[PDB]
Amino acid sequence: KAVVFGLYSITPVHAGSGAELSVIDLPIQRERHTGFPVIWGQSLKGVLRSRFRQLELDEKIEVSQKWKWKEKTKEVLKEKADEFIKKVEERKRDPLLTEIVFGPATDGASEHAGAVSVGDAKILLFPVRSAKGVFAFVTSPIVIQRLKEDFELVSVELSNNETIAGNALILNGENKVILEDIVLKVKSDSNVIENLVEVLKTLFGDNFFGKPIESIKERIAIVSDDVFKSFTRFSTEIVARVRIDAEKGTVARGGLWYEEFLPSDTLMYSLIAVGSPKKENLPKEVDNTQKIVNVLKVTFNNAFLQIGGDETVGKGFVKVRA
Amino acid sequence: MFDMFEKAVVFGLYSITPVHAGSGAELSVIDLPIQRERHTGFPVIWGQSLKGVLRSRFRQLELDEKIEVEQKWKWKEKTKEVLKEKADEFIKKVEERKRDPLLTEIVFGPATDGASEHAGAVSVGDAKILLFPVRSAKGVFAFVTSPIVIQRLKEDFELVSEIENDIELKKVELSNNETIAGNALILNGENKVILEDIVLKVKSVIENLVEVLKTLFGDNFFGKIKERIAIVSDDVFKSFTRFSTEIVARVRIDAEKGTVARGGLWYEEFLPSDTLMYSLIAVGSPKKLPKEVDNTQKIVNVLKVTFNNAFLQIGGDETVGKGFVKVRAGV
Amino acid sequence: DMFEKAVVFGLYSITPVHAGSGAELSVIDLPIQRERHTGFPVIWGQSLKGVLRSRFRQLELDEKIEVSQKWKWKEKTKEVLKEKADEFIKKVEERKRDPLLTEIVFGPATDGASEHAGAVSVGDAKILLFPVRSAKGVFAFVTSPIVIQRLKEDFELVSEIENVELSNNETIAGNALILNGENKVILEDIVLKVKSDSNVIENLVEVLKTLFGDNFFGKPIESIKERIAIVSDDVFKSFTRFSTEIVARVRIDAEKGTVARGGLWYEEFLPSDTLMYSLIAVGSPKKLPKEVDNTQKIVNVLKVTFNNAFLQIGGDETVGKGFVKVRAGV
Amino acid sequence: VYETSIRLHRNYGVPYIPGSALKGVAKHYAFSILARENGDEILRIYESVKEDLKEDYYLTAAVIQELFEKKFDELGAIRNTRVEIGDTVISVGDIVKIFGTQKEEGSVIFFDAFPTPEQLKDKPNLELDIMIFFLTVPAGVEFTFAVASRDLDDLAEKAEKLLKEALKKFGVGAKTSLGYGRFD
Amino acid sequence: DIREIEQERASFAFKVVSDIKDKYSQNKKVQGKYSSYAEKAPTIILNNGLGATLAFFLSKLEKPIDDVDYKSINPESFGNAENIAYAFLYKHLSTWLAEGNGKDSAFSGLTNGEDPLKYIMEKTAIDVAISTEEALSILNWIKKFAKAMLEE
Amino acid sequence: IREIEQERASFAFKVVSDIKDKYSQNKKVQGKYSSYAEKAPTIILNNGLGATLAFFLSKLIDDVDYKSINPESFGNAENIAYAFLYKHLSTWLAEGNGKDSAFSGLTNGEDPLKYIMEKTAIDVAISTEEALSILNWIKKFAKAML
RNA sequence: AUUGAAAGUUGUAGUAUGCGGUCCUUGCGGCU
DNA sequence: CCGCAAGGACCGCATACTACAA
């Protein structure tokens, strides 16, 4: 089985990519083939693992009872339990359920594999400033086609000057939408936006991260593939940061650089592919795929996570729907 | 479900002078614009700008033993209490401005030299607009806000609710030509308000919003408003924040000729005074420790006592009287 | 955060003051600076600092700065820059840099901008008392609740560094403004009913006594109290908009002695007897002689240099505009 | 709405003379003396500027103004040219520094002129006159004038002598061609 | 989608200036006078006040400044170019303060249809201040189009 | 938002080249156009787009029509440069690079000044931003060619 | 029974320091 | 009582414009 993780950014997000080619000092992670913003599976998995690990150590994981990992470790590893628990306290290994779900810490890597495969978080809706309705949730046919393909397997035609948009974006009678400083003419369409919303509802539910999904429908703008790509590459936040030499009260030597941010109000999705738990002598309540899936949903549904860098300057916060 | 943090504090920021949180020079008519959220056009102060301001103030207070914890905080003594043997060498680094005093590094993270040792304990959120001052035909000016701002405020309360695990801690629709406004703004016998260059029809929410502002910032509002509160539509509010900021021509005068020098004429943007912004300050467990500040609650207490009712300067142009704000830090 | 001392610079206009904001396509070609959301006249901090800096510079180059003895910058530069002192003096003489103490207080000129920040913060000059023509009492010194509220907040800032409700037809005014047994005051084109109060004006005068003493820019403070009026914010806004000085100026064609084509324009001025104030915050210098090596020393130099001084602010200097009397209240 | 007016001080009501007018009448008087005494030479040296303006006195005065106002970088030719007013020697170069140009502020401050308080007490500062009635300042009213140097050149003395003569020969204010605005 | 008052000011100003040019295309005197009076008007308002300015115009038409409704004034019933222009300017200014650019426009006036001069001599100082600023704003736009369109 | 920049740059290069072509020997005209191009955004910033267009109008009428302007028929450099800048700015807002290009204007052939008087506040704001942007490109090529 | 298992490009970092909307300019001419 | 009814200069210059560990 599999769990679809919806990620909605509430603060700007910097998932750092060193290998990305850019005129920016610190660019964000992007897909090679599409140039779309992305969060790597490995970045997301690290975030998910760290949160899960903290909860397990704090006895806040629920399986519908309180998970006691040291008790479960002893009824699983038996004679080798005490040394394992010692390694956990020594930060050489992670607690039991964490290692079952995400795999052993590097020291014990060869013992068995992690049950989950954490996929890239792919972009779905990208916020763009709109003359009407503050901003639009922008997407493209290539994005919708990717979403549909990912969902169908786990279970549109537009010119560069056209957009399929909700009513709240459209200038009265002019049949136009204005995204930032460019004008797109509205193409008449009946069900494409409606179909998209339905897909979103089928994956994340009635409430769209704290708001009715029907409200989102009025502010969705579907643009051409080239236009969407342009916005995702040139409308992300590019911010100058400095370091001040407080001795002089001026910018220190080598104290100026530029950093890219994925904006807040971005919707992304990651498919979490879950295989069978691979550790030997599993406790009964987590001995198969469905049980791992269930724990994943309860633990992360409606959760708040921090993804990427710049945590202490308020970046990377997302709402999660699983 | 926000278990990475344990407590949070809202930092209310009220400007008493114009504020220039800068983003750098542009090839444009406005040479030096203020910081803005690009996809909404709303003015902001990035968390890293605010963190730098908070860090610098906190650091100076700790060096001058003005920091209150639970009595006075003697950072050198507490340093010796924690680092023990190699404490003397650490203090020498601080005096050489290589490292920062103990509590400063615990809260905000180590100076750049010790960056790899541990992360900072607090998360300084971007400051966002809550009330924006707009000139009014009647009542001089209005504190303007909008549903999308009110909504973002409620959502931030949900963040605080999730962090503090307080479920107890957790509708405005307006046409573009409509407003919900206080009595001081309403023209004599017309049921209309004129803000900037826009006529708005008065609609029959403010009292509730004030009660919310009274929760975060206490019974008094930064030592001072319902009569001049105006709620307008999201797009009208957006246009105000983007086109009703102060745009000022500045010059450099040749000290001998009394005339404008070359490369001495530019336009600079300022967030107006009487602007209310707020930042969410999340606090997690310290990652570096003395008993006085070994957990989240103790760090929160230090933050509250240190910055509540204090004055800060944010952004550039401090020397020409810009960026002065009053802070209210409530839980 | 290094600000340990704050001094208030009182600015009392002797001649009309034009702090310009650029030309506009309207009847008033050259308007004065105003705060946008209130419409209140102001002098931006940068406008005031440039004048203070210019004055301080001219006084330092003429050895007229006292620190209670004379200040020699060339000698103090030799003690500070040592080997590179002769190079720095050549820069100042070539107007590429400014003299030592000027750069310490106000910050370096362009060439040395990144070396260190200025030691002082020159606040925006805010309106405190606006002169309004009065039927009785010749003219009144008028303020408003917003102004008083801002004055109060600025004091909460100063003390931190050093470590009234009126309707549109009401006024709190001194006796010299009130019509004989009518309990009414007439200010410009506005008739106001006197509101009985016994604290607002008194406390306001006490504030001015704390700052400027009994000497209120050439007159006893008691004389002013009888002509102080507080009005509503709306009324004060109307005064500062429609009771500024609007002056028609021309340029004469020497050919016929007539107004040249496009030789007629209007300029706006703050009237004489306008009281404005600016918060001057002082912190530890960041560049330095031991005479001026801390906050308290800089403050003492700022006070004595500018207290009771006559300063020109804004434009039209050579036609006699912008001259104010300065009081430095510590 | 009166169809006529007079500069009265906003706060005190007294009539007064703006520094702009005082500076103006002094500069235009300087234009006059240079034209009557050095008109032929100035019109000959600056024939190019003369063509722009256009051939009598009134053409010379306009040419001198344009030189001082617009083409002041070309005043090197007659910079040493001097004028007497009356026993003091003032050069063209001095006049340039006194009033200044677009490239350099004037070296002399021309303040507003006000009537002494003693006269406000003793005599009428205003009286009605007829052209249509209009307010005037009566003959016999004493005003206090002041000019100040703001440069190391110290040209306030030359400016003072130039202004004094202007107030005698040209006069200030409206209707100078009828004798109004004269000072003794 | 709303409009700003500036848009209505520009619209109204163009309309009234075009109306004069249409009704008096052969009369350069009427056009030249109107432009002169539009240019003069804001200065009179700043020095003497809006009420005195409106009364100043009416006195030129020898109308009783206390007993005249703006709607009753018909500029096309005067002989000399001066009174025609004064009547137009008074009419346009009063119409703006009284009705704006229409009841369904983004600005329908300030006096709610009441004659502006009667309004001034009846209301409070703050009401007059708001109308005074608006009078200056519409006159600024009348001046703009008069300068470009009306001939001398 | 990138293709629109290229369109602006293409227009800007074209109109400045026309200025330099017609008035090659006339440095006064070229210098005047350059100065006005630099001042234009400032006038817009301080007075709004409507007033600025009106200001240009006064430098030239029967009707507000940028098409009917003939810059070369004026007497002095000041009016020639003003008429050209005015027509250039108006042409861009109304026509763009033509209807055979990506950007064909915002006002659909209507004079921008009359357009401002008739349309919504939103329509005016985008026209203001677009006006500032094209002038910003004209300033670039002006400094490099004139 | 797959060169496989396991691993958050993250931590620290104030777009800031210097900079007067200033300089040149008679509300006048006598006309409509 | 009549007439007028802005214009050009400056046009962001300079500095800082990654550092370092893990």
CSV table of N, CA and C in Angstrom, one decimal, chain B residues 16-18 56-57 60 133-141 184 196 222-224 228 243-246 248 250 252 255-256 272-274 311 318-322 324 326, chain C residues 1-3 21 34-38 40 44-46 49 57 93 95 98 106 110 118 120-124 146 149-150 152-154 156-157 160 168 233-234 237 281 286:
chain,number,residue,atom,x,y,z
B,16,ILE,N,6.8,53.5,15.3
B,16,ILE,CA,6.6,54.8,15.8
B,16,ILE,C,7.3,55.8,14.9
B,17,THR,N,8.2,55.2,14.0
B,17,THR,CA,8.9,56.0,13.0
B,17,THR,C,8.7,55.2,11.7
B,18,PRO,N,8.9,55.8,10.5
B,18,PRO,CA,8.9,55.0,9.3
B,18,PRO,C,10.0,54.0,9.3
B,56,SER,N,21.3,40.9,18.4
B,56,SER,CA,22.2,42.0,18.7
B,56,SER,C,21.8,42.7,20.0
B,57,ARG,N,20.5,42.9,20.2
B,57,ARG,CA,20.1,43.5,21.5
B,57,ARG,C,20.3,42.6,22.7
B,60,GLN,N,24.0,42.4,23.6
B,60,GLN,CA,24.5,43.6,24.3
B,60,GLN,C,24.0,43.6,25.8
B,133,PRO,N,-1.8,51.7,8.3
B,133,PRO,CA,-2.4,53.1,8.4
B,133,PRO,C,-2.6,53.7,7.0
B,134,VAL,N,-3.9,54.2,6.8
B,134,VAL,CA,-4.3,54.8,5.5
B,134,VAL,C,-5.0,56.1,5.8
B,135,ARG,N,-4.6,57.2,5.1
B,135,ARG,CA,-5.3,58.5,5.3
B,135,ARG,C,-6.8,58.4,5.0
B,136,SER,N,-7.5,59.1,5.8
B,136,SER,CA,-9.0,59.1,5.7
B,136,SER,C,-9.5,60.6,5.6
B,137,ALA,N,-10.5,60.8,4.8
B,137,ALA,CA,-11.1,62.1,4.6
B,137,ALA,C,-11.6,62.6,6.0
B,138,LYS,N,-12.1,61.6,6.8
B,138,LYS,CA,-12.6,61.9,8.2
B,138,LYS,C,-11.9,61.0,9.1
B,139,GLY,N,-11.4,61.6,10.3
B,139,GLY,CA,-10.7,60.8,11.3
B,139,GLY,C,-9.2,60.7,11.1
B,140,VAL,N,-8.7,61.6,10.1
B,140,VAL,CA,-7.3,61.7,9.8
B,140,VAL,C,-6.7,60.4,9.2
B,141,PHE,N,-6.7,59.3,9.9
B,141,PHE,CA,-6.3,58.1,9.2
B,141,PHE,C,-7.0,56.9,9.8
B,184,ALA,N,-15.3,57.1,13.7
B,184,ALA,CA,-14.5,58.3,13.5
B,184,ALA,C,-14.2,58.5,12.0
B,196,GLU,N,-7.8,57.1,1.2
B,196,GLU,CA,-6.9,57.5,0.1
B,196,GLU,C,-7.8,58.1,-1.0
B,222,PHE,N,-0.2,48.9,23.2
B,222,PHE,CA,1.1,49.5,23.1
B,222,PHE,C,1.2,50.9,23.8
B,223,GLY,N,0.4,51.0,24.9
B,223,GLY,CA,0.4,52.2,25.7
B,223,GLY,C,-0.4,53.3,25.0
B,224,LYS,N,-1.5,53.0,24.4
B,224,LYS,CA,-2.4,54.0,23.7
B,224,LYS,C,-3.8,53.9,24.1
B,228,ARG,N,-11.2,53.9,14.7
B,228,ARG,CA,-10.5,54.2,13.5
B,228,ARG,C,-10.1,52.9,12.8
B,243,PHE,N,0.7,50.9,-2.5
B,243,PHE,CA,0.8,52.2,-3.1
B,243,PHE,C,0.6,53.3,-2.1
B,244,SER,N,0.4,53.0,-0.9
B,244,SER,CA,0.3,54.1,0.1
B,244,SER,C,1.4,54.1,1.1
B,245,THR,N,2.6,53.5,0.7
B,245,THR,CA,3.8,53.6,1.5
B,245,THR,C,4.4,55.0,1.2
B,246,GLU,N,5.3,55.4,2.1
B,246,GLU,CA,6.1,56.6,1.9
B,246,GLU,C,7.1,56.4,0.9
B,248,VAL,N,10.1,58.6,-0.8
B,248,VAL,CA,10.8,59.8,-0.5
B,248,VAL,C,12.1,60.0,-1.4
B,250,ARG,N,15.6,61.5,-1.8
B,250,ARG,CA,16.7,61.9,-1.0
B,250,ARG,C,17.9,62.4,-1.9
B,252,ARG,N,22.3,63.9,-2.0
B,252,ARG,CA,23.5,64.2,-1.3
B,252,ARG,C,24.0,65.6,-1.8
B,255,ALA,N,29.1,69.7,-0.3
B,255,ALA,CA,29.3,70.5,0.9
B,255,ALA,C,29.9,71.9,0.6
B,256,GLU,N,30.5,72.1,-0.6
B,256,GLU,CA,31.1,73.3,-1.0
B,256,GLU,C,30.2,74.1,-2.0
B,272,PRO,N,5.0,53.0,6.7
B,272,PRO,CA,4.6,54.2,7.6
B,272,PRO,C,4.7,53.9,9.0
B,273,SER,N,4.8,54.9,9.9
B,273,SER,CA,4.6,54.8,11.3
B,273,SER,C,3.1,54.4,11.5
B,274,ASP,N,2.8,53.9,12.7
B,274,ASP,CA,1.5,53.4,13.1
B,274,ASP,C,1.1,52.2,12.3
B,311,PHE,N,11.8,48.9,23.1
B,311,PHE,CA,11.9,49.5,21.8
B,311,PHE,C,13.1,48.9,21.0
B,318,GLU,N,19.0,53.8,10.3
B,318,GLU,CA,18.8,54.1,11.8
B,318,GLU,C,19.3,55.5,12.1
B,319,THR,N,20.3,56.0,11.4
B,319,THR,CA,20.9,57.3,11.7
B,319,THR,C,20.1,58.5,11.3
B,320,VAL,N,19.1,58.2,10.5
B,320,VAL,CA,18.1,59.3,10.1
B,320,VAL,C,16.8,59.0,10.7
B,321,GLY,N,16.7,58.3,11.8
B,321,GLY,CA,15.5,58.1,12.6
B,321,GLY,C,14.5,57.2,12.0
B,322,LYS,N,15.0,56.1,11.3
B,322,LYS,CA,14.0,55.1,10.7
B,322,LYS,C,14.1,53.8,11.4
B,324,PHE,N,12.2,52.5,14.1
B,324,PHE,CA,11.9,52.4,15.5
B,324,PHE,C,10.6,51.8,15.7
B,326,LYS,N,7.9,49.6,18.7
B,326,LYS,CA,7.6,49.2,20.1
B,326,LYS,C,7.2,47.7,20.1
C,1,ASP,N,21.4,49.9,19.9
C,1,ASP,CA,21.5,49.2,21.2
C,1,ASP,C,22.6,49.8,22.0
C,2,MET,N,23.4,50.6,21.4
C,2,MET,CA,24.5,51.3,22.1
C,2,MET,C,24.0,52.7,22.6
C,3,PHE,N,22.8,53.0,22.3
C,3,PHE,CA,22.2,54.3,22.7
C,3,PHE,C,22.0,54.4,24.2
C,21,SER,N,9.8,68.5,-1.0
C,21,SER,CA,9.6,67.1,-1.3
C,21,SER,C,9.5,66.8,-2.8
C,34,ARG,N,5.4,66.1,4.2
C,34,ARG,CA,4.3,65.6,5.0
C,34,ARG,C,4.3,64.1,5.2
C,35,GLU,N,3.9,63.7,6.4
C,35,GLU,CA,3.7,62.3,6.7
C,35,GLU,C,2.4,61.9,5.9
C,36,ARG,N,2.5,60.8,5.2
C,36,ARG,CA,1.4,60.5,4.2
C,36,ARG,C,0.1,60.2,4.8
C,37,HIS,N,0.0,59.3,5.8
C,37,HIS,CA,-1.3,58.8,6.3
C,37,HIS,C,-2.0,59.8,7.2
C,38,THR,N,-1.2,60.8,7.7
C,38,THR,CA,-1.9,61.8,8.6
C,38,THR,C,-2.0,63.2,7.9
C,40,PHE,N,0.3,65.3,8.2
C,40,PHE,CA,1.0,66.3,9.1
C,40,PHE,C,2.3,66.7,8.5
C,44,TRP,N,11.9,65.3,7.6
C,44,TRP,CA,12.5,64.0,7.7
C,44,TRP,C,13.9,64.0,8.3
C,45,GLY,N,14.2,62.9,9.1
C,45,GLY,CA,15.5,62.9,9.8
C,45,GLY,C,16.7,63.2,8.9
C,46,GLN,N,16.7,62.7,7.7
C,46,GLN,CA,17.8,62.9,6.7
C,46,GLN,C,17.9,64.3,6.3
C,49,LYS,N,19.5,65.9,9.5
C,49,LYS,CA,20.9,65.5,9.8
C,49,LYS,C,21.9,66.2,8.8
C,57,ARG,N,30.4,70.4,10.5
C,57,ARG,CA,31.5,70.3,9.6
C,57,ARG,C,32.2,71.7,9.5
C,93,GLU,N,40.8,68.0,2.7
C,93,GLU,CA,41.1,69.2,1.9
C,93,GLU,C,40.6,69.1,0.5
C,95,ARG,N,38.1,67.4,-0.2
C,95,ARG,CA,36.6,67.2,0.0
C,95,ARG,C,36.2,65.7,-0.4
C,98,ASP,N,35.5,63.9,5.3
C,98,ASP,CA,35.2,64.9,6.2
C,98,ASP,C,36.1,64.9,7.4
C,106,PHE,N,28.6,61.9,12.9
C,106,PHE,CA,27.6,61.7,11.8
C,106,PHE,C,27.9,60.6,10.9
C,110,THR,N,31.5,59.5,1.8
C,110,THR,CA,31.3,58.4,0.9
C,110,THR,C,32.5,57.4,0.9
C,118,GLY,N,27.6,55.9,11.8
C,118,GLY,CA,27.5,57.1,12.5
C,118,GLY,C,27.1,56.8,14.0
C,120,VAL,N,25.3,58.9,16.0
C,120,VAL,CA,24.0,59.4,16.4
C,120,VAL,C,22.9,59.1,15.5
C,121,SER,N,21.7,59.1,16.0
C,121,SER,CA,20.5,58.9,15.2
C,121,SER,C,19.6,60.2,15.2
C,122,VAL,N,19.5,60.8,14.1
C,122,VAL,CA,18.7,62.1,14.0
C,122,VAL,C,17.3,61.8,13.6
C,123,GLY,N,16.4,61.9,14.6
C,123,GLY,CA,15.0,61.5,14.3
C,123,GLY,C,14.3,62.5,13.4
C,124,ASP,N,13.2,62.1,12.9
C,124,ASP,CA,12.3,63.0,12.1
C,124,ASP,C,11.8,64.1,13.0
C,146,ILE,N,-3.3,63.4,18.9
C,146,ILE,CA,-2.4,62.5,18.2
C,146,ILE,C,-0.9,63.0,18.5
C,149,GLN,N,0.0,62.3,22.1
C,149,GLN,CA,0.2,60.9,22.2
C,149,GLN,C,1.5,60.5,21.6
C,150,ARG,N,1.9,61.1,20.5
C,150,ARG,CA,3.2,60.8,19.9
C,150,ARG,C,4.4,61.4,20.8
C,152,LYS,N,4.2,61.6,24.0
C,152,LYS,CA,4.3,60.7,25.1
C,152,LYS,C,5.1,59.4,24.7
C,153,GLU,N,4.9,58.9,23.6
C,153,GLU,CA,5.6,57.7,23.1
C,153,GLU,C,7.1,58.0,22.9
C,154,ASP,N,7.4,59.2,22.4
C,154,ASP,CA,8.8,59.5,22.2
C,154,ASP,C,9.5,59.7,23.5
C,156,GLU,N,8.8,57.8,26.2
C,156,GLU,CA,8.9,56.4,26.6
C,156,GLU,C,10.1,55.8,25.9
C,157,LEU,N,10.5,56.3,24.7
C,157,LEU,CA,11.7,55.9,24.0
C,157,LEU,C,13.0,56.6,24.6
C,160,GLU,N,13.8,55.1,27.9
C,160,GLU,CA,14.4,53.8,27.7
C,160,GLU,C,15.9,53.9,27.4
C,168,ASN,N,-14.9,67.5,17.3
C,168,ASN,CA,-14.5,68.5,16.2
C,168,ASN,C,-14.8,69.9,16.5
C,233,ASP,N,-8.2,66.1,16.2
C,233,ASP,CA,-7.3,65.6,15.2
C,233,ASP,C,-7.7,66.1,13.8
C,234,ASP,N,-9.0,66.0,13.5
C,234,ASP,CA,-9.5,66.5,12.3
C,234,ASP,C,-9.3,68.0,12.1
C,237,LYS,N,-5.6,68.7,11.5
C,237,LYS,CA,-5.3,68.3,10.1
C,237,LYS,C,-5.7,69.4,9.1
C,281,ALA,N,19.3,60.6,19.2
C,281,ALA,CA,19.8,59.5,20.1
C,281,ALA,C,21.3,59.4,19.9
C,286,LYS,N,32.0,54.2,16.7
C,286,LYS,CA,32.4,52.9,16.2
C,286,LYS,C,33.7,52.9,15.4
